[PDB]
Every structure is written in C-alpha cells, then in structure tokens.
Design a protein around this ligand. Structure first.
Ligand SMILES: *[C@@H]1O[C@H](CO)[C@@H](O[C@@H]2O[C@H](CO)[C@@H](O)[C@H](O)[C@H]2NC(C)=O)[C@H](O)[C@H]1NC(C)=O
Ligand SMILES: *[C@@H]1O[C@H](CO)[C@@H](O[C@@H]2O[C@H](CO)[C@@H](O)[C@H](O)[C@H]2NC(C)=O)[C@H](O)[C@H]1NC(C)=O
Ligand SMILES: *[C@@H]1O[C@H](CO)[C@@H](O[C@@H]2O[C@H](CO)[C@@H](O)[C@H](O)[C@H]2NC(C)=O)[C@H](O)[C@H]1NC(C)=O
Ligand SMILES: *[C@@H]1O[C@H](CO)[C@@H](O)[C@H](O)[C@H]1NC(C)=O
Ligand SMILES: *[C@@H]1O[C@H](CO)[C@@H](O)[C@H](O)[C@H]1NC(C)=O
Ligand SMILES: *[C@@H]1O[C@H](CO)[C@@H](O)[C@H](O)[C@H]1NC(C)=O
Ligand SMILES: *[C@@H]1O[C@H](CO)[C@@H](O)[C@H](O)[C@H]1NC(C)=O
Ligand SMILES: *[C@@H]1O[C@H](CO)[C@@H](O)[C@H](O)[C@H]1NC(C)=O
Ligand SMILES: *[C@@H]1O[C@H](CO)[C@@H](O)[C@H](O)[C@H]1NC(C)=O
Ligand SMILES: *[C@@H]1O[C@H](CO)[C@@H](O)[C@H](O)[C@H]1NC(C)=O
Ligand SMILES: *[C@@H]1O[C@H](CO)[C@@H](O)[C@H](O)[C@H]1NC(C)=O
Lengths: 346, 193, 96, 48, 97
C-alpha cells in the first residue's frame, strides 16, 4: 500500500448558499493539503477492495481505463443486520437503494466483451426504505483500452441524515500516479438516507481478472480554509491555513497577496486529537426506586427532605418503566446532566 | 413530512435540546432546527400495538433511523398497548414534524397570494416570494445563473431580484438619494432657504 | 564620553541615569522558560503572555544610542557648530 | 510612562473576570452546563 | 424537586462515565468531573488544601486541577505559546518566509 501525496486536492462546496466576490473563511471538514493518500492497484500480472474507513468524509479519486470503477457500497458493518446505501450503475441506469443487503465477499461485475453480463453485486434485499432508478447515462464502453484516459474524483458527506455527493471528471494523458493542481467539485446529489455510515467499499468490473485501474482514498479532517469567489460563483483559489507560515499569514491578513514586511500571525497550528476523562470510581446505584416509588408520598404542607450522596446518576432505568408528565430544569440543560458531577443533591 | 406516533406525555420530548426515551434512542432533532411541530390526540382511530427502542448502546445522531429489531442478544424493543379506557398520559398521539429552508433556489411550496402589477421608478414596498422590503424598482442588465433568484451586494444587501411571473432581472435602489444641504440665515432675520 | 579602558560602552553619567528607572516591574525582558515551569505561574507577566499580550522589543538597542550620543558629543567638542551644516571643520576648543 | 503601560496591561488582563451578564465569567462552565441551543446567547455576551 | 449545586468540593453524585489514561505535554481536551476544557496537562507541584479541586487565576481561569484518581495535582497551560512573526518579501518577488 504505497502512499502518494495529494497536492491541493479535494476542495468542495460545504455550504449551499450563493456567494460572489467574497473571501469568506469556513470551518468545516476538508482534505488537508499535501496529505498522503493510499494507492490501490488493479493489475493483472491484484484485485483488492478492502473495507475502507469512512470517518467524517472520504476523498475518492480513481484513474479508470475502460470503466473499471463502477460505483460504491456504503454501510456500517456490511452484514445482515445493518442497511447499505449502494450507488451502482447497471451499465445503463443508476440505482440508489437503501435496503437490507446480502452482499458477497467480492462484489465483482462482468462485461459484454466475454458474452456474459450478470450483475453480481448482491444476493437479495428486503425491508427497503429508499429506492430510485434514473437512466441519465449511455451504455459504457465495455471493450477495453490500452492506456489511461480520464480521472474522476468523488467526495461523500453524511450530515444530519442527508447524504451529499460531489463529483468531478477530467481528461488527462497519464501513465502512473496522480497529477498536481487545484480541483474543485460540485454537488449533484443531496439524498435523504437516515442511516449511519462508517465503512464503504468499491465495486470493480472483472473479466474472466481486470486489466489495469487505480484509485486513491483519503479522509477529511477538521480544518480552516480560506476560499476565493469570482463573479460566476466558482472557486478560483483556496489555501489551507495549517501547513505553512505563509498560509497562516495569508489567513491572518485576510488577503491572498501580501507586501514586504513583518506581520504577526494568529494560531491555526495545533488541534486536539485525543480526549482525557477522569471520574471518581463509585459504583453504587442511586436509590431511584425508594425515593421516587415510595409507598406513600407526604402531603404538600408537610413536605419532607432527603439527602443523596455517594451515588451514580442513571436515569436510564426509568426509560422502560415510567413516563414523566413534566420534567424541566433551571440552571443546567436537561441534556448535559448525564456527564455532570454534583456536590450535594436534595 | 417526518411522521410517527408516540404517547401523549412524550410530546414535550420532540423539541431541540431534550432527553427521554424519544430524543435519545428513537428520534432526535438537530439543535439548529427551523421547522414546525404539530401534534394532536387520536385515541379512538389508532388501536393496536406499537414499539419503541428502550435501551441502546449509544445515542442517536440528528435525523438518524435504525430498524434493528434485535441487537446483540436482546430485542431492545418494548411495546405499549394503545386503546381507549386508558389514562390520558398513556394515550396515542399523532405527531407531524415539518422542516423548511429558504435558499437562493426557485420556490416549490408557497402560500396563497394574488400578484399585482409591476411599478417601476417609484418608491414602493415590494414582495418577492416572501421577501418584503422597500426600494425603487427598475429594469436591470445584469446576468444571473439559471437557478438563482436574488443576488447580494458586498454588504449583504439584496440589490437585484428576479420576478417569478416573467423571468427577468430587476434592480433595487434606495428611495432617499445622497446628501441634501440646506443654506439659511438666522430664523429671526428671515425664513428663505 | 565613554571610557576606552572599561568593559562598558556608556559613560559615567549615562551609567548613573540607568539604575534609576526600574524596568523590572513592567517585565519588558522576560524569558518563556520560567513562565512554563509552573513554580511562579502566578506572576503578573506570565498571565499577559498566556492571554496573548506581548511586548515587542525596540529596534535600536542601548549600545547604538550610546554610540550616537558619543558621536554627537565628540563632534560638538572637536568641530563645534559647523558639523551640522556641511563637513566637519576642526577648531581649538578655546576659540570655539 | 512605564507605570502607565504596566497598569494598562494589568487592567486589560484583570478585566476578564466580568461575566457581562452571562451565568459565568469562564467559557468552560458555560459549555459544560448548557446545550448548544441556549449556550450561544451567553457566549455572544462575553464576546461583545 | 431536585436541587443540585456545584462548588470547589469533592463530588458525591456523578454520572456514568469511564475513566481513561492520562496524557501529558500534549494538546488535548480533558474532562475532570464534568469540567470540560482544552489545554496541555503537566505534572505540577503546587499545594492545595485537603478538599480543594481546582485553583484559579486572577482572571478566573482554571490553571491547576486535582484529578479524582491517584489524587495528584496537574497544571493546565494553553496549547498556543507566545507570539510568532513571519518575515516575508513580496509575493510577486518570492514565496520564501
Ligand atoms: C454506526 O452505527 C453502528 C451501529 O451502532 C456503530 O457500530 C458500533 O458502534 C458502537 C458504539 O459504541 C461501537 O462500540 C462498536 O465498535 C461499533 N461497531 C460494531 C461492529 O459493533 C458505528 O460505530 C456507527 N458509526 C459511527 C461513525 O458512529
Ligand atoms: C412502584 O411499585 C409498585 C409496587 O409497590 C408497582 O405497582 C405494581 O407493580 C407490579 C410489579 O410486578 C405490577 O405487576 C402491578 O400491576 C403494579 N400495580 C399497580 C397498582 O400499579 C408500581 O408499578 C411501581 N411504580 C410506580 C410508578 O408506582
Ligand atoms: C426494564 O429494564 C430493566 C433494566 O434493564 C429490566 O430489569 C432487568 O430485568 C432482567 C430480567 O428480569 C434482570 O435480569 C436484570 O437484572 C434487570 N436489571 C436491573 C438493572 O434491574 C426490566 O426487566 C425491564 N422491564 C420491565 C417491565 O421493568
Ligand atoms: C505522508 O505519509 C506518512 C506515512 O508514510 C504520514 O506520516 C505523513 O503524515 C504524510 N504526509 C506528509 C506531509 O509527510
Ligand atoms: C440473511 O438474511 C436473509 C434474509 O432473507 C436470510 O435468508 C439469510 O439466511 C441470512 N444470512 C445469514 C444469517 O448468514
Ligand atoms: C439495469 O438494472 C436492472 C435492475 O434495475 C437490471 O434488471 C438490468 O439487467 C440492468 N440492465 C443491464 C443492461 O444490465
Ligand atoms: C419488513 O419488516 C417487517 C417487520 O419485521 C416484516 O414483517 C416484513 O415482512 C418486511 N418486509 C419484507 C419485504 O421482507
Ligand atoms: C463566467 O462564466 C461564463 C460561462 O458561464 C464565462 O463566459 C464568463 O467569462 C465568466 N465570467 C467571469 C467574469 O469569470
Ligand atoms: C495578487 O495581485 C495581482 C495584481 O494585483 C492580482 O491580479 C492577483 O490576483 C493576486 N494574486 C493571487 C490572488 O494569487
Ligand atoms: C404564469 O407564469 C408564467 C410563467 O412564468 C408566465 O408566463 C405567465 O405570465 C403567468 N401568468 C399567467 C396569467 O399565465
Ligand atoms: C480508584 O480510586 C482510588 C482512590 O482514588 C485510586 O487510588 C485508584 O487508582 C482508582 N482505580 C482503581 C482501578 O482502583
């Protein structure tokens, strides 16, 4: 698994609003500049498509030769108990289904050059909650080709139950590796899915073993980006302000151009990566049954007062037993008391 | 049009920033929600058995759905019986949750409103798909995209808009124009300016 | 004028003018090693650095300014009033 | 001049303890008590 | 009617949470009995009382804290350190700083 640098690659539209002639700064998930992606081959003299890692986003760039890369299969565990969200072309249409899939170990395809077409992506589906078929493409060139012709880049983002797809497609004359330059994407799909995605694959077309293909997988990370917009509404320049002092200077000065001098810069250098949690080791369950569900509650004019100490605070035991008519908190949020520690409770 | 069916006492949990058995393991709304929540009681026409996830290994992301009827070695699907002759905190309640967004895109769902004639080169208060404002309207020569409706200035001020009746571009300018100075002598001397 | 037989590049009166303004209270010359130690983390300077309030150093140092004053005094003594107009013209001090 | 500059910097440092109408003068006990729905109306007071 | 309170005292009622390992001299985000923050942890040497959990600065910024496990004292420092200046010629001339 050799690693190739990604020079100024993977810039998309993180916001759906329209902006023209603006140097607006975003703070979202992006592919870091000059990052090292992994290289996956498809040579004949092999066929590998392992279960990749889908974090906060994935940059997928494939240098296909003759339609070797067909589509993708998303999901969480790729089992019988979780839903997949495949986006695969049948060589004539494009089908986007979110069902309970029964995929094989290797989801290969077959081409019409060998007089055998049979889509072997999955066995059967059931309890499908989303399906749409569109035929906005022509049949792919099933006969093969002697050199690389075009490269296609894709980015998938899952957020708030919405799955957004960004794509670009450029013709080159390549032999090995990934070119250098700035590439922007555009949204084409904003589907509602409703599932959670943590791992994804790629389906490739086999011929009975493919000739030659290569794709690269990256992972988006939290970063600060400055973007430039023209009069058309497109991105013409983008700098990642976490790699060089000049990038940080350009971010601080709010301009892509600087004069000669010495300027003080802000801090976009470090970012936390791991969390530290320290709690006292108390394992006693609180008396939530002898306080709430007592035999006789007192009358209002002679209300009692009980002290709570040396406990653990678990409201979850009330989830399958009782429903509270009203429950409102003053001073603290009713959603941040799961991880709080108190000194005295009455 | 997210639709479901819960008990009557849990309607308070369908809100931004709440906990319980609904907003933790069943259906969670995002914090920056912009919509409407509608709920009403139908305890007569909804009789049967309906399920809900009691306990889970982790919480739910906003607008996330899981149909796992059995996780690990347990079902994690408790059931309540819906009928009449039952206390009102334990009765069925239909809930419909809507969600809006107002982007620079052509409108699809609108309200009932009758369109009037177009007046140009006058100080009028306009209305373009709910965008209420005041200004002087005139024909524009600017070029737009194929989808966008209103283009903004450098100070986030809408200066151009597209009327959905006849697809064309209009320009918006303020009614007051520039600085106007008044030259006068003292009031006790005269009143001519 | 400065004494050539001394390790200091400043004169006697210029040395007496120093050690009269206490610059240690303002914390103009402080290292970052003692602030990060944590023994004296309750200082009034380390909080300024921790909250992003730094003090930039002056461009000209004290030795350059002392050299400037020594050059001006030597030009006044040897030449007089005529080194501010054009070239320096020598003249005995009694006649000046 | 030295005393005035030192006093101004010390006052600028010590002016961080005013809560400005929020529930606390620190950003850690606001973000660890209130959820993101109603914590934005308290941070903005501190920033302004 | 429940009425909690938060003080500089040892806690008695806490939520369910699992403690992890301690990482020093790195930019991390911590959680000490529901006190969520972000900083660099360093083994300190300051002296507290028999009950004090976290000390405070003049600007009400928590800089020293006692972890509930092993009862040691840890110092908190900002991740960013000092002022950094960039000296550059013109962009049209070069791009070396
Ligand atoms: C997507 O949801 C699935 C199903 O809940 C998650 O898979 C497990 O999540 C738990 C949460 O505590 C982890 O402990 C397990 O290790 C996960 N894997 C398995 C195989 O059980 C998955 O993590 C979710 N993905 C994201 C990105 O949150
Ligand atoms: C509180 O405890 C009481 C018993 O002291 C519960 O009442 C009974 O619980 C049993 C549990 O096996 C049920 O079979 C009965 O139907 C319950 N009877 C009644 C009249 O409710 C009670 O459910 C508990 N909870 C509350 C909220 O009162
Ligand atoms: C509600 O949830 C509780 C908590 O899980 C269940 O109580 C468990 O019941 C099983 C089966 O009898 C026992 O083995 C466990 O020890 C119980 N756990 C606890 C924490 O008490 C309970 O059965 C569920 N159902 C009802 C109707 O109360
Ligand atoms: C390059 O790949 C290496 C692993 O070989 C990785 O540690 C590093 O972060 C990547 N990027 C750069 C810019 O060195
Ligand atoms: C997966 O589920 C299907 C449902 O049709 C079933 O036929 C199949 O046996 C299952 N496979 C397993 C459990 O490996
Ligand atoms: C297109 O997909 C459909 C399923 O929607 C499948 O039956 C059909 O065979 C596909 N067409 C081709 C040419 O493979
Ligand atoms: C969908 O799930 C329900 C609930 O388990 C089941 O009854 C039904 O048969 C499923 N549908 C299909 C097509 O298998
Ligand atoms: C905007 O894009 C159009 C094509 O849609 C092109 O003709 C034009 O030159 C572009 N204008 C600017 C100012 O970039
Ligand atoms: C820097 O300045 C030139 C000349 O004004 C300008 O045209 C150019 O866009 C700027 N360079 C960038 C943004 O790289
Ligand atoms: C209806 O809308 C169309 C399309 O914008 C427009 O041409 C037409 O004038 C409108 N009014 C009527 C009365 O048809
Ligand atoms: C439990 O708490 C005690 C007392 O603070 C501490 O010494 C110990 O390390 C903690 N953990 C375990 C696993 O005993």
């Amino acid at each position: 698994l050799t690693q190739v640098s990604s020079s100024r690659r993977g810039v998309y539209y993180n916001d759906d609003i329209f902006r023209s002639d603006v140097l607006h700064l975003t703070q979202d998930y992006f592919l870091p500049f000059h990052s090292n992606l992994t290289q996956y081959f498809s040579l004949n003299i092999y066929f590998d498509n392992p279960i990749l890692k889908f974090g906060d986003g994935v940059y997928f760039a494939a240098t296909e030769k003759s339609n070797v890369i067909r589509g993708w299969v998303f999901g969480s565990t790729f089992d019988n108990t979780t839903q997949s969200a495949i986006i695969v072309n049948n060589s004539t249409h494009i089908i986007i289904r979110v069902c309970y899939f029964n995929l094989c170990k290797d989801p290969m395809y077959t081409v019409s050059a060998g007089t055998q077409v049979s889509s072997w992506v999955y066995q059967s589906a059931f309890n499908c909650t989303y399906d749409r078929v569109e035929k906005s493409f022509q049949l792919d060139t099933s006969p093969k080709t002697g050199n690389f012709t075009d490269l296609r880049e894709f980015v998938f983002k899952n957020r708030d139950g919405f799955f957004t797809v960004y794509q670009t497609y450029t013709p080159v004359n390549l032999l090995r590796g990934l070119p250098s330059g700035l590439s922007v994407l555009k949204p084409i799909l904003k589907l509602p899915f409703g599932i959670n995605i943590t791992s994804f694959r790629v389906v490739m077309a086999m011929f009975s073993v493919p000739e030659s293909a290569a794709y690269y997988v990256g992972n988006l990370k939290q970063s600060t980006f400055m973007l430039s917009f023209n009069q058309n509404g497109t991105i013409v320049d983008a700098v990642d302000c976490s790699q060089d002092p000049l990038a940080e200077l350009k971010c601080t000065t709010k301009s892509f151009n600087v004069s000669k001098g010495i300027y003080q810069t802000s801090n976009f250098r470090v970012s936390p990566v791991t969390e530290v949690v320290r709690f006292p080791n108390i394992t006693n369950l609180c008396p939530f049954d002898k306080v709430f569900n007592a035999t006789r509650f007192p009358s209002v004019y002679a209300w009692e007062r009980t002290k709570i100490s040396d406990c653990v605070a678990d409201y979850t035991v009330f989830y399958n037993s009782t429903s509270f008519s009203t429950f409102n908190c003053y001073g603290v949020s009713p959603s941040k008391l799961i991880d709080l520690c108190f000194t005295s409770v009455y | 049009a997210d639709t479901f069916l819960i008990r009557f006492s849990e309607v308070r949990q369908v809100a931004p920033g709440q906990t319980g058995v609904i907003a933790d393991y069943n259906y969670k709304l995002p914090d920056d929600f912009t919509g409407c929540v509608i709920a009403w009681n139908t305890a007569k026409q909804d009789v049967g058995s309906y399920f809900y996830r009691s306990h889970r290994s982790s919480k739910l992301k906003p607008f996330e759905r899981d149909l796992s009827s059995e996780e690990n070695g347990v079902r994690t699907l408790s059931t309540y019986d819906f009928n009449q002759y039952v206390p009102l905190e334990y009765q069925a309640t239909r809930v419909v949750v809507l969600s809006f967004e107002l982007l620079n895109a052509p409108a699809t769902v609108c309200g009932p409103k009758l369109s009037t004639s177009l007046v140009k080169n006058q100080c009028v208060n306009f209305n373009f798909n709910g965008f209420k404002g005041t200004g002087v309207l005139t024909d524009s020569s600017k070029t737009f995209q194929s989808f966008q409706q209103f283009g903004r200035d450098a100070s986030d001020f809408t200066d151009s808009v597209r009327d959905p009746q006849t697809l064309r571009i209009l320009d918006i300018s303020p009614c007051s124009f520039g600085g106007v100075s008044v030259i006068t002598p003292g009031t006790n001397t005269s009143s001519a300016v | 004028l400065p004494d050539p037989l001394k390790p200091t590049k400043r004169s006697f009166i210029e040395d007496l003018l120093y050690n009269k303004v206490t610059l240690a209270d303002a914390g103009f010359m402080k290292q970052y090693a003692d602030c990060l130690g944590g023994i004296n983390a309750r200082d009034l300077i380390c909080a300024q650095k921790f909250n992003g309030l730094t003090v930039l150093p002056p461009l000209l140092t004290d030795d350059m300014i002392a050299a400037y004053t020594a050059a001006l005094i030597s030009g006044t003594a040897t030449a007089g009033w005529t080194f501010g107009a054009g070239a320096a013209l020598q003249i005995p001090f009694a006649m000046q | 001049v030295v005393n005035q500059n030192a006093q101004a910097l010390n006052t600028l440092v010590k002016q961080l303890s005013s809560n400005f109408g929020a529930i606390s003068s620190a950003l850690n006990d606001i973000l660890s008590r209130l959820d993101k729905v109603e914590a934005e109306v308290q941070i903005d007071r501190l920033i302004t």
